[PDB]
Coordinates of C-alpha atoms and ligand atoms in Angstrom, one line a residue:
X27 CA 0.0 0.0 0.0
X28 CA 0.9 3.4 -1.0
X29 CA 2.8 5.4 2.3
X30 CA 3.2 8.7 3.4
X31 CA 6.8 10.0 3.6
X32 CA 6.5 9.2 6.9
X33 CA 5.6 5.6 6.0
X34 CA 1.5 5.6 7.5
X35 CA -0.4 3.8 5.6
X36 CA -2.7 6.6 3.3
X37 CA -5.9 4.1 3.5
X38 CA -5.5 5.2 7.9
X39 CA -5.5 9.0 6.3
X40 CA -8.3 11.1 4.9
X41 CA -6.3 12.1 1.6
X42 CA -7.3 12.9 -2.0
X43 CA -5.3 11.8 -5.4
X44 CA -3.4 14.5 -7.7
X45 CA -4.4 14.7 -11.6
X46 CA -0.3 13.5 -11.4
X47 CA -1.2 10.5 -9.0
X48 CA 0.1 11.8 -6.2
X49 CA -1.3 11.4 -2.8
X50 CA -2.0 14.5 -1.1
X51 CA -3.1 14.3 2.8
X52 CA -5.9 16.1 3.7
X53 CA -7.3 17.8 6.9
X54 CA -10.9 18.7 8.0
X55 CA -12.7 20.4 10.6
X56 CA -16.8 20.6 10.4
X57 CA -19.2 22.0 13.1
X58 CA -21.7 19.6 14.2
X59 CA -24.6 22.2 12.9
X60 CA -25.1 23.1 9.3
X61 CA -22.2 24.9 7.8
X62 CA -22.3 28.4 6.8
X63 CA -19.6 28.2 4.2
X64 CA -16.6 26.2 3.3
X65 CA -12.8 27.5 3.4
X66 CA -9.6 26.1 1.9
X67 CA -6.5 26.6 4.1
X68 CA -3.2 27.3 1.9
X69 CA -0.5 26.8 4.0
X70 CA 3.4 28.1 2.5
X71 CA 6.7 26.7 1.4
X72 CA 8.1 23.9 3.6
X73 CA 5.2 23.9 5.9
X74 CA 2.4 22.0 6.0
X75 CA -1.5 21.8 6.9
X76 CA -1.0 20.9 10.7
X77 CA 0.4 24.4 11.4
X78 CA -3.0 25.6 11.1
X79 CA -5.4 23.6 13.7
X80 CA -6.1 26.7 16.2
X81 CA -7.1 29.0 13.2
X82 CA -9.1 26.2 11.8
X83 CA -10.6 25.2 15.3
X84 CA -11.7 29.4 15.2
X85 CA -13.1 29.1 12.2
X86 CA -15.0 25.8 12.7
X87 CA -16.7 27.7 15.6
X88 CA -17.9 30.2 12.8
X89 CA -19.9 27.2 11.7
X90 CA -18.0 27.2 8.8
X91 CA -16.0 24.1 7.2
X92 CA -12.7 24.5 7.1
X93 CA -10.7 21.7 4.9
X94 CA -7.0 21.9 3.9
X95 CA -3.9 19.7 2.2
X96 CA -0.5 19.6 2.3
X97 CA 0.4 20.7 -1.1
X98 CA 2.8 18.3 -3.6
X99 CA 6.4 17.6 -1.8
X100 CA 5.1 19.5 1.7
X101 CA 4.1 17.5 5.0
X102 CA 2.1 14.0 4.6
X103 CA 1.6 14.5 0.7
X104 CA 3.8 12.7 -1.9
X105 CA 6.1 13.7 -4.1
X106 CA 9.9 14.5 -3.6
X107 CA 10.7 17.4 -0.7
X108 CA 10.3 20.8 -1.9
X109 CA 9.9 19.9 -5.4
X110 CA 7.5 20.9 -8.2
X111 CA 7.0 20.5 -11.7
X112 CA 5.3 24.3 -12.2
X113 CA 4.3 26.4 -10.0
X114 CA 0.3 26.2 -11.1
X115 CA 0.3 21.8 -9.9
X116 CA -0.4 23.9 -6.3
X117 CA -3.6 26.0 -7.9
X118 CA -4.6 22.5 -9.9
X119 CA -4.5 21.2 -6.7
X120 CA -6.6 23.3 -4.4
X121 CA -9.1 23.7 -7.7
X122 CA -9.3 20.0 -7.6
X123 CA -10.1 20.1 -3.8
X124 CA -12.3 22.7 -3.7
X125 CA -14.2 21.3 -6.8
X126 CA -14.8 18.0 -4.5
X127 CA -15.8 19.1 -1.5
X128 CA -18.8 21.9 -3.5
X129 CA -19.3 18.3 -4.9
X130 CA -20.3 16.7 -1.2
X131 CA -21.6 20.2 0.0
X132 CA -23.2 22.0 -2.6
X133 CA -24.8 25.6 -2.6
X134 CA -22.4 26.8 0.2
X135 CA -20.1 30.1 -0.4
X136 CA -16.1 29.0 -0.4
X137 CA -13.0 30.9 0.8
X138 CA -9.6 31.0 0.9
X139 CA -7.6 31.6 3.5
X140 CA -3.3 31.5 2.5
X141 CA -0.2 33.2 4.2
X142 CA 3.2 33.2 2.4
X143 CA 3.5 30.9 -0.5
X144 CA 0.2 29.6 0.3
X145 CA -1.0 32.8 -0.2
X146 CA 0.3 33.3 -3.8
X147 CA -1.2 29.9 -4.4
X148 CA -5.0 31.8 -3.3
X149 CA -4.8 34.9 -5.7
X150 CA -3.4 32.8 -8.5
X151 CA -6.6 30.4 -7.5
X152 CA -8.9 33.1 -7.4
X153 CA -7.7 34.3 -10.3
X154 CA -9.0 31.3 -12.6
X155 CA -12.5 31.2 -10.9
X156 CA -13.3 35.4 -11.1
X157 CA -16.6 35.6 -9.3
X158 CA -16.7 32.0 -7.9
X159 CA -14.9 32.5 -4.6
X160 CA -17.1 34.7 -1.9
X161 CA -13.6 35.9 -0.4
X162 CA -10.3 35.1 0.8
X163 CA -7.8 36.1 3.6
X164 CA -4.1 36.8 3.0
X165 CA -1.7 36.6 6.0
X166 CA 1.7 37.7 4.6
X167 CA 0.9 36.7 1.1
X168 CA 3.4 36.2 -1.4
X169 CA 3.3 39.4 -3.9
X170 CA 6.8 40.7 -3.9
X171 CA 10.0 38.7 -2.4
X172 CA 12.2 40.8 -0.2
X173 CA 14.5 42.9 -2.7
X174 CA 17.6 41.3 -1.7
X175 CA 17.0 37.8 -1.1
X176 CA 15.3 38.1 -4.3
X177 CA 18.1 40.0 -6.2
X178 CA 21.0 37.2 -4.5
X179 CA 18.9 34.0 -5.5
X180 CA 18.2 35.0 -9.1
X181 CA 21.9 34.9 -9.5
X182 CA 21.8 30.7 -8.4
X183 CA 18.8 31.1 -10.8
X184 CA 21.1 32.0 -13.7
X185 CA 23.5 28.9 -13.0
X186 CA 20.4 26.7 -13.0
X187 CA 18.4 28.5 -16.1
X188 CA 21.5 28.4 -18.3
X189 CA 23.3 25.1 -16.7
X190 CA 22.4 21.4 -15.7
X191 CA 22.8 21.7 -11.9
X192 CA 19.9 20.0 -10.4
X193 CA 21.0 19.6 -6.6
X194 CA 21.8 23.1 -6.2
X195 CA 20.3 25.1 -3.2
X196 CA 20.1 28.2 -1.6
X197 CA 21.3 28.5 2.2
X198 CA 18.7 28.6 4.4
X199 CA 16.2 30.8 6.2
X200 CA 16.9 32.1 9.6
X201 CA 13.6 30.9 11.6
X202 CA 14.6 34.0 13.6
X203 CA 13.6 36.9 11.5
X204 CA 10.1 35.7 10.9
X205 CA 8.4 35.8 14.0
X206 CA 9.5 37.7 17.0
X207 CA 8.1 34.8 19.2
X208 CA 10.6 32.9 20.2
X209 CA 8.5 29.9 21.1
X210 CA 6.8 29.6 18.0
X211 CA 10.2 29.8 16.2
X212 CA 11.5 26.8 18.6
X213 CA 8.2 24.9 17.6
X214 CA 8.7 25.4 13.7
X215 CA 12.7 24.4 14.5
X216 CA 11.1 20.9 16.1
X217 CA 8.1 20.1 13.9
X218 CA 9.9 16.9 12.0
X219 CA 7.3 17.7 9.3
X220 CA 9.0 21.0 8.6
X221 CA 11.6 21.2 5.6
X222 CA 13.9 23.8 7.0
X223 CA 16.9 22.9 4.5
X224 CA 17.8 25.7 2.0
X225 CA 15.8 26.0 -0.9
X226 CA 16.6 23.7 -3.7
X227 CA 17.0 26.5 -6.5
X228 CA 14.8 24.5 -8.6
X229 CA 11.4 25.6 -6.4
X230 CA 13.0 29.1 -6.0
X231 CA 12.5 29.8 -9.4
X232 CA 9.1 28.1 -8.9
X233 CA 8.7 31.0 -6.6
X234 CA 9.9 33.5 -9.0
X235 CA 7.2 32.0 -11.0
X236 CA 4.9 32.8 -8.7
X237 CA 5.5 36.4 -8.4
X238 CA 5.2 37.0 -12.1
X239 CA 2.2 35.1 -11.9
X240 CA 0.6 37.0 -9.5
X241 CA 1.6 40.2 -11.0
X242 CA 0.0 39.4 -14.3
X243 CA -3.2 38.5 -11.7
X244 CA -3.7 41.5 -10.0
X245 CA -5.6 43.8 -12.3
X246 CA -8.0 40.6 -13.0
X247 CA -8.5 40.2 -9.4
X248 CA -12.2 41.1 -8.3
X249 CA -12.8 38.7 -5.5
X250 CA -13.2 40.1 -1.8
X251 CA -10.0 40.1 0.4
X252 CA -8.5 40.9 4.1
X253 CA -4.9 41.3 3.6
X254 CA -2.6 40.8 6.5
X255 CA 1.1 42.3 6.9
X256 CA 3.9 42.7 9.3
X257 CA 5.8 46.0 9.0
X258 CA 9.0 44.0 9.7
X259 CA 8.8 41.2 7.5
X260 CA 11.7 39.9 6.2
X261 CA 10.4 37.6 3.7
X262 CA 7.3 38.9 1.9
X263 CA 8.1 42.4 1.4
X264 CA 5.5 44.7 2.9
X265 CA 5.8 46.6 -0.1
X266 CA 3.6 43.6 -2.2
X267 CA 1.1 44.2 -0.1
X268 CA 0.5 48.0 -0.7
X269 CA 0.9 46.7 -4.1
X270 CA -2.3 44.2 -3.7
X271 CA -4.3 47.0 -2.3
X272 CA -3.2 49.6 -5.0
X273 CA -3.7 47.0 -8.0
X274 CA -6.4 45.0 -7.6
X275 CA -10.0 45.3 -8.8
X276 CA -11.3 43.8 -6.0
X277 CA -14.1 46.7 -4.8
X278 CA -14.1 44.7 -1.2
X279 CA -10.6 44.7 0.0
X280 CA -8.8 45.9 3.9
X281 CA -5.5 46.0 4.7
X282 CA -4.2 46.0 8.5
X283 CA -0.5 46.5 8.9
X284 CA 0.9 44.9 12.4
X285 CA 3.9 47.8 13.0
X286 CA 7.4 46.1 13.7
X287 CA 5.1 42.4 13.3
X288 CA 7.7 40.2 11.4
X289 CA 6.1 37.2 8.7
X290 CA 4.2 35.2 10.2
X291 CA 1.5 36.8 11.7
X292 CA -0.5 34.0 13.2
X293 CA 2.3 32.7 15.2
X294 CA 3.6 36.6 16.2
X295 CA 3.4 38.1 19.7
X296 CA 0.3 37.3 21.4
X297 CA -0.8 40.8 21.1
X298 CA -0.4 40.4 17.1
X299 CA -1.3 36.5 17.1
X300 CA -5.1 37.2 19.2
X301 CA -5.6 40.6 16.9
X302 CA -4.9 38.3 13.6
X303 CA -7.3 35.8 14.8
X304 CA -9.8 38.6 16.0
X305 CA -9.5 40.3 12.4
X306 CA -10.1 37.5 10.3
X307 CA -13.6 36.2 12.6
X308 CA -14.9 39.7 12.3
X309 CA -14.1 39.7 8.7
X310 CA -15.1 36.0 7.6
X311 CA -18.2 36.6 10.1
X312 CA -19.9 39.9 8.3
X313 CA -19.2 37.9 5.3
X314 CA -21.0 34.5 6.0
X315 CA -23.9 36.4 7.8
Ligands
LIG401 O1 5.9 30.2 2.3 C1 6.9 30.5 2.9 C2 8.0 31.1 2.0 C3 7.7 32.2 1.2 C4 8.6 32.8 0.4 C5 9.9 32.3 0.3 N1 11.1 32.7 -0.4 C6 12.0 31.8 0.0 C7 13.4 31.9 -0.5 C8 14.3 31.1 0.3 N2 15.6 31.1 0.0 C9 16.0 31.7 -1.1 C10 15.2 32.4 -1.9 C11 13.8 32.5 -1.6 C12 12.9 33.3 -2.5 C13 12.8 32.6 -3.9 C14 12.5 33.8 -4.9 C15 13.3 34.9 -4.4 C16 13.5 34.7 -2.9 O2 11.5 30.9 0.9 C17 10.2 31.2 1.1 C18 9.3 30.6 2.0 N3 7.1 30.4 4.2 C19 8.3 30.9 4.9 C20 8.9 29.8 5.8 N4 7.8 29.4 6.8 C21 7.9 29.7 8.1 N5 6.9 29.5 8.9 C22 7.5 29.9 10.1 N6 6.9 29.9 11.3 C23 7.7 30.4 12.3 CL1 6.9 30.4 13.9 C24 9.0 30.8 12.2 C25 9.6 30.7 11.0 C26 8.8 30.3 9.9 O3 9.1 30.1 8.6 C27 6.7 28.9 6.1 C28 6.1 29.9 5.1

């Protein structure tokens, strides 16, 4: 029988099978009432799903349904670490997902909800449905890559573009200068379902991808959003996010900026971490009313 990384069994798993063939673990949490609405967790590079139970368990008390995966090469899904074929197998992914689960509970409205990579992945997934998602919440999304990280990799990207080099990697990220929490950065530094080795360069052109992607995107995008964003954040420069707001069509769309907050917002200082979780029940609530 076909095995998680981690060698469990995926007929003990709830999980769902790529359009590649490729096993991809899913997550779910319903209310025991009727739902409201459904809403598709995208979690970000070298992360997975699990990171997100106490924002789930939140929204689940909206009486919504929240479901998630671990996207291709992340977490309990298949597919080799922190690999992927083009950037748009995570959108075809979620799509596919989503598409199921209207499938088992029709009529209801669906959201996003994506920070980081994950986050990319839900405009660019918006993006192909305008007018079919009823909104979707950005925490730190991916829109523009911090100027230098992003200058100093596309240099590895030019050995790999022009060059057969297929192991070749960038070093890797300091947990440290994403969250000012330090027990939430000693958590992600133990969770054995984290990839925390540099980025094979491969995937951060992937990235690059993304970026473009979600450039083209913007000035298609219509579909309701609360975008999230640390001052301080040293990944996803806060400087995408004023773009988001400036460029999209979207006539619903907020923006809250968490001053000195570094990336990742829903793991921050408790005073950030409750106000994140505050912001997106008010927001999802006036929305599923
Ligand atoms: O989605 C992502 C993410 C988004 C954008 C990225 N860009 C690169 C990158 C890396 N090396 C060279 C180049 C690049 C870019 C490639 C194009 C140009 C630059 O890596 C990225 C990862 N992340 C971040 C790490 N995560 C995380 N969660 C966490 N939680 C706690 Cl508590 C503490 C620390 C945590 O770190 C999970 C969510």
């Amino acid at each position: 029988p076909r095995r998680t990384p981690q060698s469990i069994p995926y007929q003990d798993l709830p999980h769902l099978v790529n359009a590649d063939g490729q096993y991809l673990f899913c997550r779910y949490w319903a209310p025991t009432g009727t739902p409201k609405a459904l809403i598709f967790v995208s979690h970000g590079a070298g992360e997975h799903s699990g990171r997100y139970e106490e924002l789930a368990r939140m929204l689940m008390g909206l009486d919504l349904l929240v479901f998630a995966h671990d996207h291709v090469g992340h977490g309990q899904s298949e597919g080799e670490r922190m690999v992927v074929s083009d950037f748009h197998v995570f959108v075809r992914d979620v799509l596919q997902h989503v598409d199921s689960m209207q499938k088992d509970y029709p009529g209801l409205p669906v959201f996003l909800l994506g920070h980081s990579m994950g986050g990319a992945i839900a405009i660019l997934t918006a993006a192909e449905r305008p007018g079919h998602f009823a909104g979707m919440v950005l925490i730190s999304p991916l829109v523009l890559a911090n100027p230098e990280s992003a200058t100093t990799f596309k240099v590895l990207a030019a050995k790999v573009l022009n060059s057969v080099l297929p192991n070749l990697s960038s070093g890797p990220i300091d947990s440290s200068v994403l969250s000012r929490n330090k027990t939430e950065v000693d958590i992600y530094n133990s969770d054995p379902l984290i990839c925390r080795a540099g980025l094979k360069v491969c995937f951060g052109i992937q990235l690059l991808n993304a970026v473009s992607r979600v450039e083209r995107a913007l000035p298609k995008l219509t579909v309701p959003f609360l975008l999230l964003q640390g001052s301080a954040d040293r990944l996803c420069d806060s400087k995408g996010a004023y773009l988001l707001m400036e460029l999209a069509k979207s006539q619903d769309k907020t923006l809250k900026i968490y001053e000195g907050a570094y990336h990742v917002l829903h793991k921050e200082l408790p005073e950030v971490t409750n106000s994140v979780f505050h912001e997106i029940n008010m927001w999802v609530s006036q929305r599923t009313a």
